[PDB]
Amino acid sequence: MAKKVNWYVSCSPRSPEKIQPELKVLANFEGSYWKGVKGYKAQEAFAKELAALPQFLGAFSTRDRVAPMKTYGFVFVDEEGYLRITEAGKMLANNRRPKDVFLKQLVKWQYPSFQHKGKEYPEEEWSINPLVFVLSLLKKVGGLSKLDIAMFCLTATNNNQVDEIAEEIMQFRNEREKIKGQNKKLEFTENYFFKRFEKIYGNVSHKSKIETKMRNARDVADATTRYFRYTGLFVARGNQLVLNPEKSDLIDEIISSSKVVKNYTRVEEFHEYYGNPSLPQFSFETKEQLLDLAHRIRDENTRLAEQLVEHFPNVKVEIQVLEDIYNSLNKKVDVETLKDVIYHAKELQLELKKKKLQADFNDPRQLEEVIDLLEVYHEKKNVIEEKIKARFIANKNTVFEWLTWNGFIILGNALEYKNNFVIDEELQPVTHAAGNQPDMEIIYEDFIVLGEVTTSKGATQFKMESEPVTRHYLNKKKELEKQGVEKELYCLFIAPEINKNTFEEFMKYNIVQNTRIIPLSLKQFNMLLMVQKKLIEKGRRLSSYDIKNLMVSLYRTTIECERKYTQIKAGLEETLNNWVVDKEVRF
Ligand SMILES: [Br-]
Ligand SMILES: [Br-]
Ligand SMILES: [Br-]
Ligand SMILES: [Br-]
Ligand SMILES: [Br-]
Ligand SMILES: [Br-]
Ligand SMILES: [Br-]
Ligand SMILES: [Br-]
Ligand SMILES: [Br-]
Ligand SMILES: [Br-]
Ligand SMILES: [Br-]
Ligand SMILES: [Br-]
Ligand SMILES: [Br-]
Structure with missing residues (x-):
């Protein structure tokens, strides 16, 4: 036929x-x-x-x-x-x-x-x-x-x-x-x-x-x-x-x-x-009913923010955007303006739902779930594929980006957790970040961290990540400077196994090209999540300062340490352990 x-x-x-x-x-x-x-x-x-x-x-x-x-x-x-x-x-x-x-x-x-x-x-x-x-x-x-x-x-x-x-x-x-x-x-x-x-x-x-x-x-x-x-x-x-x-x-x-x-x-x-x-x-696409819809979304957003703002004052970022969006109805209330307000308000609600995950992660089961899925990435490829296909629609490379981003949310304190990979309305992963972007941009009050992750190994790792990482770093720095943003830029490069040539390539850019790329093993990254988990157990948590200091300290090691792979690598573990011990948590 x-x-x-x-x-x-x-x-x-x-x-x-x-x-x-x-x-x-x-x-x-x-x-x-x-x-x-x-x-x-x-x-x-x-x-x-x-x-x-x-x-x-x-x-x-x-x-x-x-x-x-x-x-x-x-x-x-x-x-x-x-x-x-x-x-x-x-x-x-x-x-x-x-x-x-x-x-x-x-x-x-x-x-x-x-x-x-x-x-x-x-x-x-x-x-x-x-x-x-x-x-x-x-x-x-x-x-x-x-x-x-x-x-x-x-x-x-x-x-x-x-x-x-x-x-x-x-x-x-x-x-x-x-x-x-x-x-x-x-x-x-x-x-x-x-x-x-x-x-x-x-x-x-x-x-x-x-x-x-x-x-x-x-x-x-x-x-x-x-x-x-x-x-x-x-x-x-x-x-x-x-x-x-x-x-x-x-x-x-x-x-x-x-x-x-x-x-x-x-x-x-x-x-x-x-x-x-x-x-x-649609039935509700009248001025009268769009006002109602806009107001309903405003109340939902308000409820969200107000539940969070006492312990998570970084939601004050979305509260102000919220005010800017709705101030437009002051000037004009027609169907088109209402649609735009309603569109931006839903986008902002999503941003609030990302900060809400911070409160979810106060439950150690929730937090440990992220750690345990990340730990899966130490297994063989066949095991990873099976465990991820059973739990996600997205493929394991996209899910690794999403898990690392959840990791940044667990450490807390950011002004914005900018995933560059696509997520859906319930924050579940859809599509990997574009080739000309880092996987995520985590913006804090006085510094910024790019997250660059891969499940890549050995030479294809070198292959895959050496240029894009250093290029994404340098493009962002350029942009920040044009935009007058006075924040130090760091990049955290995370892999289950960081390849020595990849590593050495980033150390060279750090000292030669003034990049601030910090290579951290998945194991080292997961350590950070466990330090936060233990702090929360004890009624504490990491501060914005704490995270900055880790980034600065590790950065300094990458450029002050003796120019020898094995030395820098051991120097980063040293610096890390200091920071960890400083948190005085059961380790
Ligand atoms: Br046609
Ligand atoms: Br619609
Ligand atoms: Br906060
Ligand atoms: Br893999
Ligand atoms: Br069978
Ligand atoms: Br399928
Ligand atoms: Br079945
Ligand atoms: Br997969
Ligand atoms: Br989507
Ligand atoms: Br994809
Ligand atoms: Br088509
Ligand atoms: Br394009
Ligand atoms: Br055509």
Whole structure:
């Protein structure tokens, strides 16, 4: 059959925030001829401008990068052959309320559509809003792993199949539980997957063929969870995609008002709807009800801050931003201003939830959980992969970044815990930091620490980290100086095993290029977490000063110590132990 039998979310890119910079470049070619051979000139000029983008300075086809921008309603080619940018594409190019733009586009997203119609996508088989299908399915099955999405969701082609696939997942789960033996369970699962795709791609080395289908499905499932979590309607709970408990009413309305419109065969008529980021218009998107929503979020944020500020006065950072955001309603109260206030207020609530983790970590079980997961990174690669896949959606390299960041939060005192990796609305990890950024920036009152982490080993470690770390350091220092920020910059480089050549390369930059890179073993980093744990046990905790002094002391050792690897290494352990002993904790 030529009929397609699955939908997909693009893997180019697989994480949705990487579209904006592409789209901003593409918007420059609005009004360009973009069809046929006359289309070549503009499309090749675009391709060159895009290859200069940081994310591509590490070779695709232009058509391949543009396709998701068409599928999600940001751009189209009109009937006269010119490239056009929709209002949704314009908003995202300008970075206005991007997660909200994605929510509305992916809620409207349907099959068939202008991009996916005709012979390949017959209405007899196709009538689905993939994101909404998945919201409705989760109401039935609670959660979906990436494998669940690959096995059951992508091959759903009609909104009316929610109940049937719900029933089938539960029957799959009920049987799988009966299979005794973890390995046995893996094989059952894999064979259930093989058979299902068999009846479905029954179309036409067989096994080699449906195994490619299965592999593709897994790939797409990953991308799907990242795009869907980006909207905020979904979050991770362990290794499962689940509904965001704080968006219940919004999710109810989405399910209720979603639809497959039939006006998709001509490009203009379809994009007048699909490219409109005001559509669908939700019940509460009136001035009157947006005031109420803005005020509800303000009260939530206030409640949060006030619970924290007595023991964690660094939340005074978000309290003031909060005041600046809402002072705009003083000047003007219209729907657009309200939307912006509400967008920034949710962003700030997330910032408050990061400081709230400080209070969570007062419970030693919570704190030790972070330590214990970090300790997993001393195990062999196969063990790490298994333990992390069972507890997270994100891969183990991303999770190592997230765990190290939680480590900074446990030590406390920062003004901002700036993860550069992506997290979702429940603070769970999604996508690794970009190649041109350190993994995180922890800003304190009078110093700043970059966190650079890797699970890399030996020469590929040297390979991977020597230039980017020293470059990220130097770019940041440059930026701070241009911005007039009078704070010393440190970089903490953390690996389970720090390679001597990597180490020696950072020592050379420290003394030669005036960097302040401090290489700390995962074991040494975990020691810090244990020192804080014991202090909290005794009613104390580390101060901002304490952390500064560690950074300064270790820094000084890197440049004052004798120029010999073994000496500097032992000097750093010495300095560390002093600091630790100074805390007078049971060690
Ligand atoms: Br980029
Ligand atoms: Br194209
Ligand atoms: Br696509
Ligand atoms: Br098009
Ligand atoms: Br919305
Ligand atoms: Br998977
Ligand atoms: Br099971
Ligand atoms: Br077995
Ligand atoms: Br996200
Ligand atoms: Br604080
Ligand atoms: Br590893
Ligand atoms: Br992994
Ligand atoms: Br990633």
